[PDB]
């Protein structure tokens, strides 16, 4: 059985917990994860100054698609950088067109708004990103910790990151793989 | 009021979630955190292949002590590397002698055993690290998600990392700072 593949797009100002937790949990599930630097291959300064080194540039990772999921971490500045990128636009439009999963957390869903992705969907965000996301009425808002409307999967914050990551694993690899990955984590 | 200071010792094979979550949460609390590379300043490959760039080498960070807390992430290989380091030994002995906090998660507490730190204390670990930690009977074991016996603070796994980090914040900066840092996280 071929391994599923995930693209995690890492921009300056990304929320580092929301980057690392999904990467780690997806890799535990046997997903081949590419941490792709929006800016290139150089290390990325996250929202609380953790510095993460990409596996590859987004420019190169874009050429090795398609991916079973495209993951957008949060962080206000990270999400703004994702929102400004034409490369990200192209990747997300292609992913929607091919009926592939898109997963975004905290402020990350606001890049879906910027790139006109998933309009009409029910979404959640961090509470502090609600009004940016809802500007223009292009979505329906949800309070759920993880929200999934077809292939638009959204979540709220650092404290929903494990739930978000496990939801991605379940969507890709099924319930039993997600449950097996969950138990050694010592979640409550 | 002078900012409290934390030393997070980052070794090859460290559990990346257990590194990032405490760093991020402590920084949210206004703690000045130094992510110190055991090996030097070069990027560190974690247990699930996330690569984190240290702020400084342990060699240099050791010279800018003392620190209000020394934090030991888990990961089997990370903890083994911490356990083999004479520099880590010296830092932990100094921290115990000065009545400073030591915080270790998952397999991280097994470096306390290696360095003869805190013998007699009640500790927890990841379940899979229990028998390494208990070899020789130098500690008393606990099932609590976070365990604190004086200035020996231990915890169990990725899924206890927020609890662990908030316990460190509470110990350093008090209950109200920890509660203020907690709410925007969207923990359950």
UniProtKB/Swiss-Prot annotation, chains A, B:
<dbReference type="GO" id="GO:1903384">
    <property type="term" value="P:negative regulation of hydrogen peroxide-induced neuron intrinsic apoptotic signaling pathway"/>
</dbReference>
<dbReference type="GO" id="GO:0006979">
    <property type="term" value="P:response to oxidative stress"/>
</dbReference>
<dbReference type="InterPro" id="IPR050325">
    <property type="entry name" value="Prot/Nucl_acid_deglycase"/>
</dbReference>
<dbReference type="GO" id="GO:0030414">
    <property type="term" value="F:peptidase inhibitor activity"/>
</dbReference>
<dbReference type="GO" id="GO:0051920">
    <property type="term" value="F:peroxiredoxin activity"/>
</dbReference>
<dbReference type="GO" id="GO:0008021">
    <property type="term" value="C:synaptic vesicle"/>
</dbReference>
<comment type="subunit">
    <text>Homodimer. Binds EFCAB6/DJBP and PIAS2. Part of a ternary complex containing PARK7, EFCAB6/DJBP and AR. Interacts (via N-terminus) with OTUD7B. Interacts with BBS1, HIPK1, CLCF1 and MTERF. Forms a complex with PINK1 and PRKN. Interacts (via C-terminus) with NCF1; the interaction is enhanced by LPS and modulates NCF1 phosphorylation and membrane translocation. Interacts with NENF.</text>
</comment>
<dbReference type="GO" id="GO:1900242">
    <property type="term" value="P:regulation of synaptic vesicle endocytosis"/>
</dbReference>
<dbReference type="GO" id="GO:1990422">
    <property type="term" value="F:glyoxalase (glycolic acid-forming) activity"/>
</dbReference>
<dbReference type="GO" id="GO:0005739">
    <property type="term" value="C:mitochondrion"/>
</dbReference>
<keyword id="KW-0186">Copper</keyword>
<dbReference type="InterPro" id="IPR029062">
    <property type="entry name" value="Class_I_gatase-like"/>
</dbReference>
<feature type="modified residue" description="Cysteine sulfinic acid (-SO2H); alternate">
    <location>
        <position position="106"/>
    </location>
</feature>
<dbReference type="GO" id="GO:0006914">
    <property type="term" value="P:autophagy"/>
</dbReference>
<feature type="lipid moiety-binding region" description="S-palmitoyl cysteine">
    <location>
        <position position="46"/>
    </location>
</feature>
<keyword id="KW-0256">Endoplasmic reticulum</keyword>
<dbReference type="GO" id="GO:1902958">
    <property type="term" value="P:positive regulation of mitochondrial electron transport, NADH to ubiquinone"/>
</dbReference>
<dbReference type="GO" id="GO:1900182">
    <property type="term" value="P:positive regulation of protein localization to nucleus"/>
</dbReference>
<dbReference type="GO" id="GO:1903181">
    <property type="term" value="P:positive regulation of dopamine biosynthetic process"/>
</dbReference>
<keyword id="KW-0043">Tumor suppressor</keyword>
<dbReference type="GO" id="GO:0044390">
    <property type="term" value="F:ubiquitin-like protein conjugating enzyme binding"/>
</dbReference>
<dbReference type="GO" id="GO:0051881">
    <property type="term" value="P:regulation of mitochondrial membrane potential"/>
</dbReference>
<dbReference type="GO" id="GO:0070062">
    <property type="term" value="C:extracellular exosome"/>
</dbReference>
<dbReference type="GO" id="GO:0003729">
    <property type="term" value="F:mRNA binding"/>
</dbReference>
<dbReference type="GO" id="GO:0034599">
    <property type="term" value="P:cellular response to oxidative stress"/>
</dbReference>
<dbReference type="GO" id="GO:0045944">
    <property type="term" value="P:positive regulation of transcription by RNA polymerase II"/>
</dbReference>
<dbReference type="GO" id="GO:0006508">
    <property type="term" value="P:proteolysis"/>
</dbReference>
<dbReference type="GO" id="GO:0010628">
    <property type="term" value="P:positive regulation of gene expression"/>
</dbReference>
<dbReference type="InterPro" id="IPR002818">
    <property type="entry name" value="DJ-1/PfpI"/>
</dbReference>
<dbReference type="GO" id="GO:1903136">
    <property type="term" value="F:cuprous ion binding"/>
</dbReference>
<dbReference type="GO" id="GO:0008047">
    <property type="term" value="F:enzyme activator activity"/>
</dbReference>
<dbReference type="GO" id="GO:0050727">
    <property type="term" value="P:regulation of inflammatory response"/>
</dbReference>
<dbReference type="GO" id="GO:1903751">
    <property type="term" value="P:negative regulation of intrinsic apoptotic signaling pathway in response to hydrogen peroxide"/>
</dbReference>
<dbReference type="GO" id="GO:0030546">
    <property type="term" value="F:signaling receptor activator activity"/>
</dbReference>
<dbReference type="GO" id="GO:0030073">
    <property type="term" value="P:insulin secretion"/>
</dbReference>
<dbReference type="Pfam" id="PF01965">
    <property type="entry name" value="DJ-1_PfpI"/>
</dbReference>
<dbReference type="GO" id="GO:0042593">
    <property type="term" value="P:glucose homeostasis"/>
</dbReference>
<dbReference type="GO" id="GO:0055105">
    <property type="term" value="F:ubiquitin-protein transferase inhibitor activity"/>
</dbReference>
<keyword id="KW-0523">Neurodegeneration</keyword>
<dbReference type="GO" id="GO:1902176">
    <property type="term" value="P:negative regulation of oxidative stress-induced intrinsic apoptotic signaling pathway"/>
</dbReference>
<dbReference type="GO" id="GO:0042802">
    <property type="term" value="F:identical protein binding"/>
</dbReference>
<feature type="modified residue" description="N6-succinyllysine">
    <location>
        <position position="182"/>
    </location>
</feature>
